[PDB]
Amino acid sequence: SSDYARDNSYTKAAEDIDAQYAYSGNDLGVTYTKDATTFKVWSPTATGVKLNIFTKGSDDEQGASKVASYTLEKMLVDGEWNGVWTITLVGEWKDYYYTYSVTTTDTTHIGSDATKTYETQDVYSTATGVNGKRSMIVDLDETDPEGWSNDSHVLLDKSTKSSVWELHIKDFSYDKASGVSDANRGKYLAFTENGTTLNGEGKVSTCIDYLKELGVTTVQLNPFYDFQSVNEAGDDSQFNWGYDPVNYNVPEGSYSSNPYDGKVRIKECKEMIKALHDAGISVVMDVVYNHTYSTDSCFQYTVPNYYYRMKTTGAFSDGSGCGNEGATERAMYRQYVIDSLKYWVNEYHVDGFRFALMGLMDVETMNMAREALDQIDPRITMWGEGWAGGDSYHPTNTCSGTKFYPATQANASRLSDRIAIFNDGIRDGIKGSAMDISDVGFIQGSKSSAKGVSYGVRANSSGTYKWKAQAPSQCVTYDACHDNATLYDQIIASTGLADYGERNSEAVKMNRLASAIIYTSQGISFTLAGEEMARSKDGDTNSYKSAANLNMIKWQNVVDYADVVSYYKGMMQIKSAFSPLTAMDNSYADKYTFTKKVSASTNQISFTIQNDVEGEWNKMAVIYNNATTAADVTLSDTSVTDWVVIANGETAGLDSLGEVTGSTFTVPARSAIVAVDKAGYESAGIHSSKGKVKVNYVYEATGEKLEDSVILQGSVGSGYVTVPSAVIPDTYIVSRIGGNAEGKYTSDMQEVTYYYTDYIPES
Numbered sequence: 001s002s003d004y005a006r007d008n009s010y011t012k013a014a015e016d017i018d019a020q021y022a023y024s025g026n027d028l029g030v031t032y033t034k035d036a037t038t039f040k041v042w043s044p045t046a047t048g049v050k051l052n053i054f055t056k057g058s059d060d061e062q063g064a065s066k067v068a069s070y071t072l073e074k075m076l077v078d079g080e081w082n083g084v085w086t087i088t089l090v091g092e093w094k095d096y097y098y099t100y101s102v103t104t105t106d107t108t109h110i111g112s113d114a115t116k117t118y119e120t121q122d123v124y125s126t127a128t129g130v131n132g133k134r135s136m137i138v139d140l141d142e143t144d145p146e147g148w149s150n151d152s153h154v155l156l157d158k159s160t161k162s163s164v165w166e167l168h169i170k171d172f173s174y175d176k177a178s179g180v181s182d183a184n185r186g187k188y189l190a191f192t193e194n195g196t197t198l199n200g201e202g203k204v205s206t207c208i209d210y211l212k213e214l215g216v217t218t219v220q221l222n223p224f225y226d227f228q229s230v231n232e233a234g235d236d237s238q239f240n241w242g243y244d245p246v247n248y249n250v251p252e253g254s255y256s257s258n259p260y261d262g263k264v265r266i267k268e269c270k271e272m273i274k275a276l277h278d279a280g281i282s283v284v285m286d287v288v289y290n291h292t293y294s295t296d297s298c299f300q301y302t303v304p305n306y307y308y309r310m311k312t313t314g315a316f317s318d319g320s321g322c323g324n325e326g327a328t329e330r331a332m333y334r335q336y337v338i339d340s341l342k343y344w345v346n347e348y349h350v351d352g353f354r355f356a357l358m359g360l361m362d363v364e365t366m367n368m369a370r371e372a373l374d375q376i377d378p379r380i381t382m383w384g385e386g387w388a389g390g391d392s393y394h395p396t397n398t399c400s401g402t403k404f405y406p407a408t409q410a411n412a413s414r415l416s417d418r419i420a421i422f423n424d425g426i427r428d429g430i431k432g433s434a435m436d437i438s439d440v441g442f443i444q445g446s447k448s449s450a451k452g453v454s455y456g457v458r459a460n461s462s463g464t465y466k467w468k469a470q471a472p473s474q475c476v477t478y479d480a481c482h483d484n485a486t487l488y489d490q491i492i493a494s495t496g497l498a499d500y501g502e503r504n505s506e507a508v509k510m511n512r513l514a515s516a517i518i519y520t521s522q523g524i525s526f527t528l529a530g531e532e533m534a535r536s537k538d539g540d541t542n543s544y545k546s547a548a549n550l551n552m553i554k555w556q557n558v559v560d561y562a563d564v565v566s567y568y569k570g571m572m573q574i575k576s577a578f579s580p581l582t583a584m585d586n587s588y589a590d591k592y593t594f595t596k597k598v599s600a601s602t603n604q605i606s607f608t609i610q611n612d613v614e615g616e617w618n619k620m621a622v623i624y625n626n627a628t629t630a631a632d633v634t635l636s637d638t639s640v641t642d643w644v645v646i647a648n649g650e651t652a653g654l655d656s657l658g659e660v661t662g663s664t665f666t667v668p669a670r671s672a673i674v675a676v677d678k679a680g681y682e683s684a685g686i687h688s689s690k691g692k693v694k695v696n697y698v699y700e701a702t703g704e705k706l707e708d709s710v711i712l713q714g715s716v717g718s719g720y721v722t723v724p725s726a727v728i729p730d731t732y733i734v735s736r737i738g739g740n741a742e743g744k745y746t747s748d749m750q751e752v753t754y755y756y757t758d759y760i761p762e763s
Ligand SMILES: OC[C@H]1O[C@H](O[C@H]2[C@H](O)[C@@H](O)[C@@H](O[C@H]3[C@H](O)[C@@H](O)[C@H](O)O[C@@H]3CO)O[C@@H]2CO)[C@H](O)[C@@H](O)[C@@H]1O
Pocket: 241, 242, 243, 244, 320, 321, 322, 323, 355, 356, 357, 385, 389, 483, 542, 544
């Protein structure tokens, strides 16, 4: 909750080590050629460093042998030691594994006889064997897949033009119904599989083909650096999010087809990224420099008590709530983090980063990292959690001698406006407190939550409620992520409308409303992968090590909630057509007219946005109605009185859904209206290229609807599958179908009617 500046023996010692031994060299770890291989280790605390060579990454493998051990020597600049140990092995050392045996004091007993010896993999490992205990010497060119030389970054012109899909690699394709091959389900190489369909029946698209259709700009991948919590030699049914770092610069083994050979995971990890780039998707990497799984790490075994934040009592500061904190303010951890980021960008073609507990990382380091990545390309995205997971004890100043500031929401002003911050303001505003699955926000009917949404609409960059972003560029707009409950699960829990993962019409209405808010709000639009298909975790509010089949994306939901997918798909189009919504800066802040005060307690939020981009819509009107009844909303902005509706309770997109004359709109219960000026709609010529299918549910005898009709919307020639309504009482059964239950989208709207008759459920 709090951070404390406390200077002590540990911090002063570490600061002295930086002053004398800070090494800006580029070459720590292994420098490989066919002719020789050089090893470098930074450890001013050591009295000796020994290199151990092996044939295999573990002793259980066929051919496993200790080759030899060698003595590293102190590296001398003049006649002076720079803190670096080095040796050069002459010959071909490709595909050998190694550890270091480091004999070392701690930071507060340098030059003393109080040493211990630790065996460790390289701090600067670029490859490891199974479970990351032994590093591997590799020619990185050999790990490049076919086409890798032609693979470019996929970068957004502006971060605020993004639509982010937060995905776990196992979740993506562990489901058998994903249509991914037995070999590749839950693995890096699932992303390379094109033409995948539900149950491989060839009717409706899944996985990579689904993402192309959905139109997400960005996939954010949950930890795919090497973590501790999956035994890579164990069973395929294991699951962890992987916020348990062991090797920061090595891919996770369990997502590969072979973790024993250290080259395989690298190649396959690159194939995943290439595949996403080929589909025109940007790749954002979840990174966790804020803590390591344990202090029995390569860092601590190489330079004890340097790389972690130390309290005066000798205890490790526990700001992460996982046991330790990485000391970003230290010269050589700062350098490690920035070099690591550059490595993932250059070597793996990563396009941006999501920083776990960014509130533990110091502002100066984050700003230097932003600067470093700008040298590559400023379009490289950065965002993080502007909070910590416990009390943080740090030195007063950084290694540069500037005051320490944590990169929290409170210090947004001190942070680059292109290091964005998760907006828990709009998160809690939309669906209720993330700390309480049963708590209600705006979509469930909270009037007091309205202000959270209203401040969220301008990315908490206009006025101050809870926290203030510098600009929309500094704000991630979201209602749910991997943490806590899924949107749909919180809707279900807070209302009691149904069981977890069961379709309910009112629940789905609330889900559509949340969609409307996210994509008519400024900042970087962000969803949990499958939010658009009503993803459930069966009520699990912390699924980090829960069952694999619980966590996995249920691909059947692309059919069961096809209409909801279609709604998101359409809302995404609206945001990307109307420039004020994807603004990086504050230039549109004074162009909003809210009908009520932003801080108002209300069932209906409405606002207009004046645009200034030629060839776009001139003005947009947006209305959220969380009431259980229809509401007539009259805009305070009466400058436009001819409107074209482009999203309602039924559908969203770029096509006209009907017109409104005047300043008053009828908004159905628990739904949104998005309208644009008539003149602008005509002149801009913005229109949908997507086909539509309308699904009706009719009592055959009378012709009355048993349930509201729904709208599917997708690319022309792409496959769709409709189903009978899941919510219709069990005393009705489908007697016949009119139209094509399944087929392909056309330019013309197609209709399917499920005709119902009287039924009594049997034994
Ligand atoms: O044994 C290791 C620790 O395991 C447990 O911590 C879990 C969390 O319960 C889990 O929610 C997840 O937290 C991370 C969160 O999902 C992510 O968004 C954020 O950026 O970082 C969080 C970690 O700081 O993962 C951790 C670690 O696996 C347990 O609660 C903890 O006490 C144990 O030390």
